[PDB]
Design a protein around this nucleic acid. Structure first.
Ligand SMILES: C[C@H](CCC(=O)NCCC[N+](C)(C)C[C@H](O)CS(=O)(=O)O)[C@H]1CC[C@H]2[C@@H]3[C@H](O)C[C@@H]4C[C@H](O)CC[C@]4(C)[C@H]3C[C@H](O)[C@]12C
Ligand SMILES: C[C@H](CCC(=O)NCCC[N+](C)(C)C[C@H](O)CS(=O)(=O)O)[C@H]1CC[C@H]2[C@@H]3[C@H](O)C[C@@H]4C[C@H](O)CC[C@]4(C)[C@H]3C[C@H](O)[C@]12C
Ligand SMILES: [Mg+2]
Lengths: 552, 1341
DNA sequence: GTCCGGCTTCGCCCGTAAATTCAGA
DNA sequence: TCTGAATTTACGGGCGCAACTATGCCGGAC
RNA sequence: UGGCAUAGUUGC
């Protein structure tokens, strides 16, 4: 293939073939004139080496290198390896009718549709647009249709809307670790340059919106479109294929909104009043007469289908909250009421969706998930749940736990210097006592954090689960766990080097406090471990899963 | 005091500790290394002088003729840096070397030579480093990253038990030379010392000892102590050294002087050793069983036969003892082979090997090095001599010899580049000592074992690599030359030098395309340390040893600013205060602590030197005199932080920032951020795009100004003075008389670089930051480049941010941006794009740039001129023709019948096709520059003529402007001088300004000064005319274009990307996010005052991603803006200067024990007004990286304003107007617009060009390629039942030519059905397998 | 400018075949 | 002096996916 | 008008 200028591409097979013909011709010429045995012997050896290099370069040794001293890619090198035909052009190929773009949120979408930009929609569906233009007589010859499409006339957009109606598009994220990494959605034309991806499916994709890009593919044939619609639609992949748990569980904002909505405090506006139903609860909350989280009595009618598929109503007076009653308007009929009478963390919502799927079916579950997402987003927005610096309250027991642990390490060191213990067991003992101290600090932090708020304006003090933002997000399961909140407020504990070796020196300061120079130097060991395992030890998991796939 | 530049805007500093050492010149490493490579060095140690003196002089193989060296010189660059960037040539200097050739006649070793012929021969060009530390190689600025390789010397490692599957820790000793062959001494499970050269094959170590002409008995005497057995009467009275009795069990009963110290069987204890040492026991009687296992030291001969009875290294037995008894040998020497302290390693090595004589050793080494070839005595001897002992082929450099001596506990640090017998013996003995148990192996990751190559050193190495080849060529030519006919010009060939030098600067793993989209990006790319590159590691080989942070990286390497990816920890970045030792090792500053007082003198310490010291931490409290107030201070003695008393402290950290680099030192509240998030924050600051206007980070760290000034993006005033003239594209500073040199007058001219393309297609533009008549001091910024405000690095914009969920539009990491942000165009960026159309001389004729474009109407060609090139300033969009070129290289010619048929159809298609460079689809903008490069003798067109005429007029105008500006300054100086001693003023204007050589002045030095000024005028005029002539010659001449290209037309578009969803934005604490919606202004949250928040972020990203530093920053930012608000409140309604300065002083005095202490009483009520004008948009605040503002100070600053101390305010919903409960955190945070724009990522393809070997879609978006349906995607589809989707995915959509063509036709026809077919890549695989001796076929059904 | 040709070592792990070393007769 | 089993040593294969930008692409006789 | 190499970068 010509390179820039008169010079041709410096091909590899051509060089090898062309220095096998050289030796062959030289040897033929030598045998024609009956050259001395030594010279023809050396020429035969060189011919053998050249042929060996052509068939598999470097296998014999002394991999012959061309210009730039790069070993030539022989036939064996072309058919084998990760860059060979099998794993580069036959098991996985580049495909037409495919595009790529950054992904955004677009909360308004339903679970079965995705926002596709108008420009990529036009570029992907060009042949379909040509077919529609020919069918409607707006362009007799394909050149005319192509010209109409490239000018982006006002009429080809209508064609694009008409042809996108019921044409699913596969959306795929780069590390397709499991089968839910590629799912079909109905396109909705978007005025922009980024694909709007439903919030619920993100967990399946492992797709956060911090720069991630995803690829769109277009099924062409009727069989492919029906396969996308009936096998790969996001509204069919409610349950993960690895286990029975739902995979479209709301991730972080919806769960926070639901946790805030379904919750109670000992004294809020409109507490103790008896409501005539969930609609009354929503009316009161919107009117500002009652807090979203205030204990009340609500007349709830729940449907139990213990009969032969017949939903039987049951009306009672439940002791609930305004927010719980409001949320009950979203739950479908067949579910019990106790399913929304708790704090509704992330696991609670996952169990709720699972039970809805097992009891009611698929379509009710999809609708329920969409409504859960909408209501959670709305009420998380209403809650105004923010994060400040005064929310990471430091425990008052942290310092004394630290001092006790330091006394323990001092005494263990004193024993070690006396020879009573050897280095390895001293290191193990130090590690264990520091782990115990870290656990104690975390426990004290959570104790001071969860019951932090005591609120009363009607009598004696009554403790309650805190409204603290950090705790409210950790308990709800939205984002983070005990470890990260511990590092924020409590002592952040021991670190591990990239080789899975634990630095016996702990970090005595949290993140709200300093982390002085020395403490921010032990931390970098753990940070280097974390980033190296992401970029160097991921090849082991990929290799293992490739072996598992290729054996089964 | 403040020098009228930082007094414009004083950044409130919260740093508690006092700065001791100013931040060094951040680009010091590159500039210094290159300066010590070209600078003339009389000592000849550095650079080209060293290379010449090491190679030259050259003699023939015999003493016939000699070529020696005199000196070298760097010629003036042929073109300026900007001219080189525009044209595309390297910015290099010619290297002209004065070489003299002498001729030696018959028997004239020292006598006068026949003739000496000396000439200044040209030896290639050497690229030059610009003032900013960068090289222009082919029009692109390139940075040569410094390398961090293993220092030359000797290193002992272990391979700790991973071999032999038994846990035994072997020991290897490697002698790494700077340039030579590797020598390794390795052990094996049998504890036999082996050696290998260049890691070819392992052979016994003693062989090389014999190769050094060592006899076996001498080897044994050298490597072992000697035990003496004396046959006085009987029992072999043995000379015993008591200290040798410890560590074993007494196999016999030991007795002397009738005192059995140790009984039979019992082991020897310490008390016994003490008693024997104090008893003065020298000789003992021994049994016969003891000597039965010893090894005789040296050979013995029998007097009767005169032949051998026992040789060296033989296990003595009863038979051998009896044989040597009667021969007369009474004193018997054996080796003291203790079991656990003096191993028989050399003895076993001597026994195992088949080599006994020196020649056998030499032939063995020759066969190992050259396997199969017939060995020769002279060949083997020469090979071994040239291995480690020739000065030309082996060289332990000065640092190498220093490390070699240090590792062997030698005294001197200077030696010979080659090895020696003593050196190898010492290395082997040290390795054996390590094996025994005394001593320790070296750790490679130690920064005292790793050097720092810089651009100068690598350039010198490559220049020497060229010069050795040149030496070979010259030596070859000297043999076959008639000496008295030729000068030293044909003798020297410059092609090797140029080839090597340009192949290192252009195509090398360390000479990298510069990351130029920020001052920070450039300044941290130049301060980069890469373990990769030639002579270094490889990302696929090194693992989890050089990636980890060593304790020695403290103060010499940033532990957190490293790239994440395949090479993490291999691309370390230099620390802020770190410097390079004389030998190339990284050293860091430390304040000396002689007595308990911390002295203010700085010592730079390297890793090894710093190891044996106790260094107090930077955050150690001190008083006015200087004393560690605390009884015990935290220090670090041997890479182990601990607590030390007040007196042992030998050193203290100079600053708290020295542990990090210039990337992480710009992150406020770094200490509160998880180290990963600090790393990501730095990596993302390196990617921020310069916005339309800089925005002066409200919460900085004090390193912004240093970074901006040190990086060559601003126009720093070379000399102080008064701004005489300032426009959008020029500054003229009249220098003060104090700083003015004598003679030349003498006013600085700074030509600002206007809108120009960067390596990342960003915009480089310098805007003046000074006005007319404004005083300027030395080192003050006059013009600020991209991402800079008043000399402070401003990578992004600070705006109002609220932390709360908002209807899911900030779900995971998405950012919700108001329409006010895009309305203000604050994150609008200018991207300049270069499009080159090349007309070449191809077959079937040349190519043409004519405007007669077929198949397109006149409307599309309206924007072009008569010459077929777009106008400057034309607003072009996607598809528009910029430079329409159509070539006679069209199509074939039609035969009579064919042509008649074509003409019958009624078509006049010609032999001209359409190439017609056009704007890429989806890219708009305005044309800002068109450059036409024409080859020599091509008849440049009308547009090229117009461009050249405009360029010539502009060059004349700028030259004349500079000349008359300088001459106005000169005449002003002359008039100022004339004011005394015969001043003429009334009639001075009567005569013309020129005729001032005839004036009347007295006799003094003033008239001499006037004469000097007049001579300066004359030479200025002459050099003016010559420079104008040179510029005209350079403009009018042709261009050295590529071989076979007629001309090049480069069009510079200037697109303006405002903002849109999908554009990635991030803060300084590793917090990312793609904009999810450009919200309406009325829909955003607003506070009690009705001011909407510019951005809404998600709180859930703060706990999960432990970057608390943002929240603190946000709070502080709010406080900062609060202060500004009050100043604005005091400023928009005019108020007295007294109250304003009072409030400003109260704001600046707010702190715990800050060391800024700015006093406003010395501002004169006029600089206070400018300061207030600068502070009305929020008071800038400096938060040092580890000495930042505590939360209490943030609360105090918040309370100084009318803001709540909690940092959280009450917000109302823009949509419903309803209050948000749970008051939200609102402040001002510094958003960066990273260089990942959605329109650069969006891509789509339905049908396009396919690859050649396999008919699959092309890859990438630069070529209209398709997305890769990877193997894992195939697995995912198999997990579904999607068989038809997969089949069409990998057959009809990828590589079935008939299948895909038919499917396209069916889609156009309205039928969605496919014919499967067979992939073409499968046929390719079949043929490739058949290209071997394998017959793979698809057998019939 | 147009036409013609054959000096780098330095990673971790595991499976398998060849060579060695016991452990005998 | 031979011969089988177990052990050691040598040596060949493996070392995730997807995506974007830039430069450079052969050295020696007529 | 499609290939390889090197360097840098993004998402996991
Ligand atoms: C004079 C100077 C020390 C002054 C006291 C000595 C000590 C170490 C020597 C350099 C290092 O070896 C690295 C490198 C080796 C190359 O081979 C030649 C260049 C380099 C820079 C050497 C030149 C010079 O010799 C150095 C700087
Ligand atoms: C202030 C200074 C006086 C110094 C005594 C005077 C004397 C010479 C003047 C400059 C140039 O010569 C002419 C040129 C004219 C163009 O329009 C752009 C302005 C230029 C650069 C002038 C600005 C200024 O007016 C100068 C520096
Ligand atoms: Mg992501």
């Amino acid at each position: 293939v010509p390179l820039d200028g008169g010079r041709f591409a410096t091909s590899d097979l051509n060089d090898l073939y062309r220095r096998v013909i050289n030796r062959n011709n030289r040897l033929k010429r030598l045998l024609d004139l009956a050259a001395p045995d030594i010279i023809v012997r050396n020429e035969k050896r060189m011919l053998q080496e050249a042929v060996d290099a052509l068939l598999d370069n470097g296998r014999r040794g002394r991999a012959i290198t061309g210009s730039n001293k790069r070993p030539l890619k022989s036939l064996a090198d072309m058919i084998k390896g990760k860059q060979g035909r099998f794993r580069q052009n036959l098991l996985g190929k580049r495909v037409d009718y495919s595009g790529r773009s950054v992904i955004t949120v677009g909360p308004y979408l339903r679970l079965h549709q995705c926002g596709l930009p108008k420009k990529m929609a036009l570029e992907l569906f060009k042949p379909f647009i040509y077919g529609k233009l020919e069918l409607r007589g707006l362009a007799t010859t394909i050149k005319a249709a192509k010209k109409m499409v490239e000018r982006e006339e006002a009429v080809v957009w209508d064609i694009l809307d008409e042809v996108i109606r019921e044409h699913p598009v596969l959306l795929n994220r780069a590390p397709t670790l499991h089968r839910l990494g590629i799912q079909a959605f109905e396109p909705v034309l978007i005025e922009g340059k980024a694909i709007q991806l439903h919030p619920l499916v993100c967990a399946a994709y492992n797709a956060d919106f911090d720069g991630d890009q995803m690829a769109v593919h277009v099924p062409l044939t009727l069989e492919a479109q029906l396969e996308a619609r009936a096998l790969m639609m996001s509204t069919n992949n409610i349950l993960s294929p690895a286990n029975g748990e739902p995979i479209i569980v709301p991730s972080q904002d919806v769960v926070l909104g639901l946790y805030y909505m379904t919750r109670d405090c000992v004294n809020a506006k409109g507490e103790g009043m008896v409501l005539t139903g969930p609609k009354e609860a929503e009316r009161l909350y919107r009117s500002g007469l009652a807090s979203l989280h205030a204990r009340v009595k609500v007349r709830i009618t729940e449907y139990e289908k213990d009969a032969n598929g017949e939903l039987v109503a049951k009306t009672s007076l439940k002791d609930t909250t305004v927010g719980r009653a409001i949320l009950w308007m979203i739950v479908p009929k067949g579910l019990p009421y106790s399913i929304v009478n708790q704090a509704l963390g992330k696991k609670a919502i996952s169990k709720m969706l699972n039970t809805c799927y097992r009891i009611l079916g698929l379509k009710p579950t999809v609708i329920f998930a969409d409504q859960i997402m909408y209501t959670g987003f709305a009420y998380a927005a209403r809650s105004g749940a923010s994060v400040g610096i005064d929310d990471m309250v430091i425990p008052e027991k942290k310092h004394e736990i630290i001092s006790e642990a330091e006394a323990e390490v001092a005494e263990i060191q004193e024993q070690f210097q006396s020879g009573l213990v050897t280095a390895g067991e001293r290191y193990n003992k130090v590690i264990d006592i520091w782990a115990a101290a870290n656990d104690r600090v975390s426990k004290a932090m959570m104790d001071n954090l969860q019951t932090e708020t005591v609120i009363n304006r009607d009598g004696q003090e009554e403790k309650q689960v805190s409204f603290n933002s950090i705790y409210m997000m950790a308990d709800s399961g939205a984002r983070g766990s005990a470890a990260q909140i511990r590092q924020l407020a409590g002592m952040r504990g021991l670190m591990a080097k990239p080789d899975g070796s634990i630095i016996e020196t702990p970090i005595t300061a949290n993140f709200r406090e300093g982390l002085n120079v020395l403490q921010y130097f032990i931390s970098t060991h753990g940070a280097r471990k974390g980033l190296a395992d992401t970029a160097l030890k991921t090849a082991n998991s990929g290799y293992l899963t490739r072996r598992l796939v290729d054996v089964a | 005091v403040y020098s009228y530049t930082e007094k414009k805007r004083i950044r409130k500093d919260f740093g508690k500790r006092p700065q001791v050492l100013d931040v060094p010149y951040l680009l010091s490493i590159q500039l210094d290394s290159f300066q010590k490579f070209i600078e003339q060095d009389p000592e000849g140690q550095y650079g080209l002088e060293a290379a010449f003196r090491s190679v030259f002089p050259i003699q023939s193989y015999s003493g016939n003729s000699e070529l020696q060296y005199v000196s070298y010189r760097l010629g003036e660059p042929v073109f300026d840096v900007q001219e080189c960037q525009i044209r595309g040539v390297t910015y290099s200097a010619p290297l002209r070397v004065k070489l003299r050739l002498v001729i030696y006649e018959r028997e004239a070793p020292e006598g006068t030579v026949k003739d000496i012929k000396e000439q200044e021969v040209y030896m290639g060009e050497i690229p030059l480093m610009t003032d900013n530390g960068t090289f222009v190689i082919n029009g692109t600025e390139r940075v040569i990253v410094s390398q961090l390789h293993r220092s030359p010397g000797v290193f002992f490692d272990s391979d700790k038990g991973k071999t032999h599957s038994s846990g035994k820790v072997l020991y290897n000793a490697r002698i790494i030379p700077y340039r030579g062959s590797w020598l390794d001494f390795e052990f094996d499970p049998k504890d036999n010392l082996f050696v290998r050269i260049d890691r070819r094959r392992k052979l016994p170590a003693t062989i090389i000892l014999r190769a050094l002409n060592y006899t076996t008995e001498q080897i044994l005497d050298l490597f072992f102590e000697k035990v003496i057995f004396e046959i006085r009467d009987n029992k072999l009275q043995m000379e015993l050294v008591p200290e040798r009795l410890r560590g074993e069990t007494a196999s016999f009963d030991i007795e002397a002087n009738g005192k059995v110290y140790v009984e039979k069987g019992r082991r020897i204890t310490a008390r016994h050793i003490r008693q024997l040492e104090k008893d003065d026991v020298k000789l003992i009687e021994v049994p016969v069983e003891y000597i039965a296992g010893k090894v005789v030291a040296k050979d013995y001969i029998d007097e009767s036969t005169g032949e051998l009875i026992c040789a060296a290294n033989m296990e003595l037995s009863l038979d051998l003892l009896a044989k040597l008894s009667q021969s007369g040998h009474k004193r018997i020497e054996t080796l003291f082979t203790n079991d656990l302290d003096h191993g028989p390693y050399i003895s076993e090595t001597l026994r195992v090997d088949p080599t006994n004589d020196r020649l056998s050793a030499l032939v063995e080494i020759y066969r190992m090095m050259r396997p199969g070839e017939p060995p020769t005595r002279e060949a083997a001897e020469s090979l071994f001599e040239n291995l480690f002992f020739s000065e030309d082929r082996y060289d332990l450099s000065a640092v190498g010899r220093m490390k070699f001596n240090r590792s062997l506990l030698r005294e001197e640090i200077e030696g010979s580049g080659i090895l020696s017998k003593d050196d190898i013996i010492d290395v082997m003995k040290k390795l054996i000592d390590i094996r025994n148990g005394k001593g320790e192996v070296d750790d490679i990751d130690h920064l005292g074992n790793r050097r720092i190559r810089s651009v100068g050193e690598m350039a010198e190495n490559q220049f020497r690599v060229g010069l050795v080849r040149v030496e070979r060529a010259v030596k070859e030519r000297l043999s076959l030359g008639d000496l008295d006919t030729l000068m030293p010009q044909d003798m020297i060939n410059a092609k090797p030098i140029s080839a090597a030098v340009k192949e290192f600067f252009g195509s090398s793993q360390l000479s990298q395309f510069m990351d130029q989209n920020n001052p920070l990006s450039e300044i941290t790319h130049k301060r980069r340390i890469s373990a990769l590159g030639p002579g270094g590691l490889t990302r696929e080989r090194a693992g989890f040893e050089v990636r980890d942070v060593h304790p020695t990286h403290y103060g010499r390497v940033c532990p957190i600013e490293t790239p994440e990816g395949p090479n993490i920890g291999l691309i370390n970045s230099l620390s802020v205060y770190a410097q390079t030792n004389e030998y190339g090792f990284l050293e860091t500053p430390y304040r000396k602590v002689t007595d308990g007082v911390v002295t203010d003198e700085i010592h730079y310490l390297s890793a090894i030197e710093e190891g044996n010291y106790v260094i107090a931490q930077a955050n150690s409290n001190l008083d006015e005199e200087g004393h560690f107030v605390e009884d015990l201070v935290t220090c670090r003695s041997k890479g182990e932080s601990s607590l030390f008393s007040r007196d042992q402290v030998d050193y203290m950290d100079v600053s708290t920032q020295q542990v990090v680099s210039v990337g992480a030192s710009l992150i406020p509240f770094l200490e509160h951020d998880d180290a990963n998030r600090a790393l990501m924050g730095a990596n993302m600051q390196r990617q921020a795009v310069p916005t339309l206007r800089a925005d002066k980070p409200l919460v900085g760290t004090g390193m912004e100004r240093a970074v901006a000034v040190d990086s060559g993006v601003t126009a720093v005033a070379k000399r102080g003075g008064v701004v005489q003239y300032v426009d959008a594209s020029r500054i003229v500073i009249k220098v003060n008389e104090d700083e003015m040199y004598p003679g030349e007058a003498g006013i600085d001219i700074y030509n600002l670089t206007k809108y120009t393309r960067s390596n990342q297609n960003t915009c480089i533009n310098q805007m003046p930051c000074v006005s007319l008549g404004e005083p300027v001091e030395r080192g003050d910024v006059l013009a600020d480049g991209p991402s800079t405000d008043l000399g402070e690095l401003a990578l992004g914009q600070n705006m109002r941010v609220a932390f709360m969920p908002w209807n899911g539009y900030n779900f995971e990491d998405s950012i919700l941006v108001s329409e006010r942000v895009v309305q203000e165009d604050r994150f609008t960026t200018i991207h300049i794009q270069e499009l080159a159309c090349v007309s070449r001389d191809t077959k079937l004729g040349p190519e043409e740039i004519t405007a007669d474009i077929p198949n397109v109407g006149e409307a599309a060609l309206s924007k072009l001129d008569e010459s077929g090139i777009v106008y400057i300033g034309a607003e072009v969009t996607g598809g528009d023709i910029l430079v329409g070129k159509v070539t006679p290289k069209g199509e074939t010619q039609l035969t009579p019948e064919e042509k008649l048929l074509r003409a019958i159809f009624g078509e006049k298609a010609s032999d001209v096709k359409d190439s017609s460079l056009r704007v890429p689809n989806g890219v708009s903008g305005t044309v800002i520059d068109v450059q036409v490069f024409t080859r020599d003798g091509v008849e440049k067109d009308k547009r090229a003529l117009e461009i050249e005429e405009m360029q010539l007029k502009q060059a004349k105008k700028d030259l004349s402007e500079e000349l008359q500006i300088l001459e106005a300054g000169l005449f002003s100086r002359i008039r100022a001088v004339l004011v005394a001693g015969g001043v003429e003023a009334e009639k001075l204007d009567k005569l013309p300004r020129d005729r001032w050589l005839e004036l009347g002045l007295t006799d003094e030095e003033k008239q001499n000064q006037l004469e000097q000024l007049a001579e300066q005028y004359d030479e200025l005029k002459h050099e003016f005319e010559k420079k104008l002539e040179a510029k005209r010659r350079k403009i009018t001449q042709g261009d050295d274009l590529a071989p076979g290209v007629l001309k090049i037309v480069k069009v510079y578009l200037a697109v303006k990307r405002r903002i849109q969803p999908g554009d990635k934005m991030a803060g300084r604490h590793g917090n990312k996010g793609v904009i999810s919606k450009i919200n309406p202004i009325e829909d955003m949250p607003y506070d009690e005052n009705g001011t909407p928040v510019d951005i809404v972020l998600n709180p859930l990203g703060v706990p999960s991603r432990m970057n608390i530093g943002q929240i603190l920053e946000t709070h502080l930012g709010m406080a900062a803006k609060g202060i500004g608000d009050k100043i604005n409140a005091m400023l928009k309604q005019q108020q007295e200067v007294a109250k304003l300065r009072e409030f400003i002083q109260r704001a600046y005095d707010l702190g715990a024990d800050v060391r800024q202490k700015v006093d406003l009483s010395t501002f004169s009520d006029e600089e206070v007004m400018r300061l207030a004008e600068n502070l009305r948009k929020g008071m800038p605040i400096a938060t040092p990286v580890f000495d930042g503002a505590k939360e209490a100070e943030i609360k105090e600053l918040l309370k100084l304003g009318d803001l709540p101390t909690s940092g959280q305010i009450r917000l109302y919903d823009g949509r419903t107007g309803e209050q948000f409960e749970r008051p939200v955190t609102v402040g001002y945070m510094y958003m960066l617009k990273l260089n990942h724009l959605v329109d650069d990522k969006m891509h789509a393809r339905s049908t396009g060009s396919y690859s050649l070997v396999t008919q699959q879609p092309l890859g990438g978006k630069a070529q209209f390629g398709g997305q890769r349906f990877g193997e894992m995607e195939v697995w995912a589809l198999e997990a579904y039942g999607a068989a038809y989707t997969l089949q069409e995915m990998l057959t009809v959509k990828s590589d079935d030519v008939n299948g895909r063509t038919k499917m396209y036709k069916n889609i156009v026809d309205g039928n969605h059905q496919m014919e499967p077919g067979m992939p073409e890549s499968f046929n390719v695989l079949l043929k490739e397998i058949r290209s071997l001796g394998i017959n793979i076929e698809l057998e019939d059904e």
